[PDB]
Structure 1
């Protein structure tokens, strides 16, 4: 909490196929959120998998 982020891309950005990206600087923690209307374990697929 409180903590924030800035540089989303940092190599770890590869942890998302097509979704939101967010890297907690102060809390070095690479984590990219999905997007929407997509699919896949990490949002690799795009729809067709409701």
Structure 2
């Protein structure tokens, strides 16, 4: 509550190649979400990586 994000990019955004980027500023905490039709945690690979 109260805590919210806005400025996603803070270097930690480099942990996400192909996925939503959200950085909780008030609580500096990186958090990315995968898009779709992809694999991995960072979402660097697109299918063919089960």
Same fold (TM over 0.5): yes
Give the ranges of 4+ consecutive aligned residues of structure 1 lying more than 6 Å apart after TM superposition: none
Once superposed, what is the RMSD of the aligned Cα atoms? 1.5
Tell me the TM-score normalized by structure 1: 0.81
Give the unaligned 5+ runs of structure 2.
none
Give the unaligned 5+ runs of structure 1.
none
**Richer in strand (by share):** 2
Q: How many residues align?
A: 50
Tell me the TM-score normalized by structure 2: 0.81
